[PDB]
Design a protein around this ligand. Structure first.
Ligand SMILES: CCc1cc(CCN)ccc1O
Length: 357
C-alpha cells in the first residue's frame, strides 16, 4: 500500500483531505475525510472560498437523480442536487466506481476561507445518510462494485499530513498490536467506553454516562468531546492534577493560554473488547488535548451528542475501520511518557455502559 501512504494533507483544525477525481474526463478535487457522516458532497458552484469545484456540464458520465438534499448543522448548512458519476482516488486503489454525489449549490458556514478542500467524503453508514438510508454511501458502492475489501484505516499525523489506506492495513504505520472494539451499531462508528482514568485514577462514574447518547470515532471533528456530566468530572480532575498554575474560561474553550507538560495528566479510555468481560485501554498524552494555535487551546469540550473521539484522539493512533467484522482497531501510531494501547483488562457488566433509545 505504498501508493497510499502520505495521501492525506491538511491544516491544523481544518480537517484532513484526500485527492479525488470525479467525472469523465477526471476532475481533480480535494475532499475532506469524515467518519462522522455518510454523504459524498462536493462544491458545484463558484463559491469565493473555493479553489476548484465540481463542474457537471463537463462530464459525459454524470447522471441527474432529480432530487434535492438539505443538510443543516447548528452552525449553518449545505444544500445540493443529487446525481451519480465516476469516482477515483489517485492515491488509492486502481478502480473507478459509480457513486452518489451531492452537488453543493448553497452553503452557510460550511466551507472554510483559506482551506484547500472543496467537499466532504462521508465514510460512515447508510443509516445517517441524507435524505435517507437508500442513498448508498461512497464506501458501500466501492465494496459492492470492486474487489476492494470492506475496511479502511486512518493515520492522522498532526501543516498536517496522514494516510488513508483503502481496502487494508499497512503495518509500517503502527507499532505494537492492534486492539479491537466492536461497532455497536452501523450508523456512525459507534463504540462503547467502559472506564475513564485521569493520570491513573478512575472518574468513578456510572459507565452508562461516558456513552450518554453515544460514543463515536469521528475524523471530521477536531476535539475530544465528552458528555456534559463527564466533561465536568473530567475537567475538575485535570484541574486537581495540575493546580500548580488558569481562568475558568480556558476550560470552557472561551480563551487561550500561554507560556511544561508534566503537570498535565495522561487520559485513558478503556474500550469494550472483543471478548466477554475483556477490555483494553488507549492513553492520550497532553500533547494531544492541548493544541497549538506558545499559546494552546484546551482541545476537550462538552457535548450534547455523546462522546466524540475526534482528530485530537485519533492523531496518536492508527485506526482501523474494520467494517467486514464490525469492529474498530487501535494501535500506537508510527508518527505520534508515550501514547499507548494496552490489554487485556477485566471489566464486568460492559453491556450496561451502552445507552438505550
Ligand atoms: C473541519 C471543519 C468541518 C468539519 C465538517 C465535518 C462535520 N460532519 C464539515 C465542515 C467543516 O467545515
Amino acid at each position: 500500500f505504498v501508493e497510499m501512504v502520505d495521501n492525506l494533507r491538511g491544516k491544523s483544525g481544518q480537517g484532513y483531505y484526500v485527492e479525488m477525481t470525479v467525472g469523465s474526463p477526471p476532475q481533480t478535487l480535494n475532499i475532506l475525510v469524515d467518519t462522522g457522516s455518510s454523504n459524498f458532497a462536493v462544491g458545484a458552484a463558484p463559491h469565493p472560498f473555493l479553489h476548484r469545484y465540481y463542474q457537471r456540464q463537463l462530464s459525459s458520465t454524470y447522471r441527474d437523480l432529480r432530487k434535492g438534499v438539505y443538510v443543516p448543522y447548528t452552525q449553518g448548512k449545505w444544500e445540493g442536487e443529487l446525481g451519480t458519476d465516476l469516482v477515483s482516488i489517485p492515491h488509492g486503489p486502481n478502480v473507478t466506481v459509480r457513486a452518489n454525489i451531492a452537488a453543493i449549490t448553497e452553503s452557510d458556514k460550511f466551507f472554510i476561507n483559506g482551506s484547500n478542500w472543496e467537499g466532504i467524503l462521508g465514510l460512515a453508514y447508510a443509516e445517517i445518510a441524507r435524505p435517507d438510508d437508500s442513498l448508498e454511501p461512497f464506501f458501500d458502492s466501492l465494496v459492492k462494485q470492486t474487489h476492494v475489501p470492506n475496511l479502511f484505516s486512518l493515520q492522522l499525523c498532526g501543516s498536517v499530513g496522514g494516510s488513508m489506506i483503502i481496502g487494508g492495513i499497512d503495518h509500517s504505520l503502527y507499532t505494537g498490536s492492534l486492539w479491537y472494539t466492536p461497532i455497536r451499531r452501523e450508523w456512525y462508528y459507534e463504540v462503547i467506553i467502559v472506564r475513564v482514568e485521569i493520570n491513573g485514577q478512575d472518574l468513578k462514574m456510572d459507565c452508562k454516562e461516558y456513552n450518554y447518547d453515544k460514543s463515536i470515532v469521528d475524523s471530521g471533528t477536531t476535539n475530544l468531546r465528552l458528555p456534559k456530566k463527564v466533561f465536568e468530572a473530567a475537567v475538575a480532575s485535570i484541574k486537581a492534577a495540575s493546580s500548580t498554575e488558569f481562568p475558568d474560561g480556558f476550560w470552557l474553550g472561551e480563551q487561550l493560554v500561554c507560556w511544561p507538560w508534566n503537570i498535565f495528566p495522561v487520559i485513558s479510555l478503556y474500550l469494550m473488547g472483543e471478548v466477554t468481560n475483556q477490555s483494553f485501554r488507549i492513553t492520550i498524552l497532553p500533547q494531544q488535548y492541548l493544541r497549538p494555535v506558545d499559546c494552546y487551546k484546551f482541545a476537550i469540550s462538552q457535548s450534547s451528542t455523546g462522546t466524540v473521539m475526534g482528530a485530537v484522539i485519533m492523531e496518536g493512533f492508527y485506526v482501523v475501520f474494520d467494517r467486514a467484522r464490525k469492529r474498530i482497531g487501535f494501535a500506537v501510531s508510527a508518527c505520534h511518557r508515550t501514547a499507548a494501547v494496552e490489554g487485556p483488562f477485566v471489566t464486568l457488566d460492559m453491556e450496561d455502559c451502552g445507552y438505550n433509545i
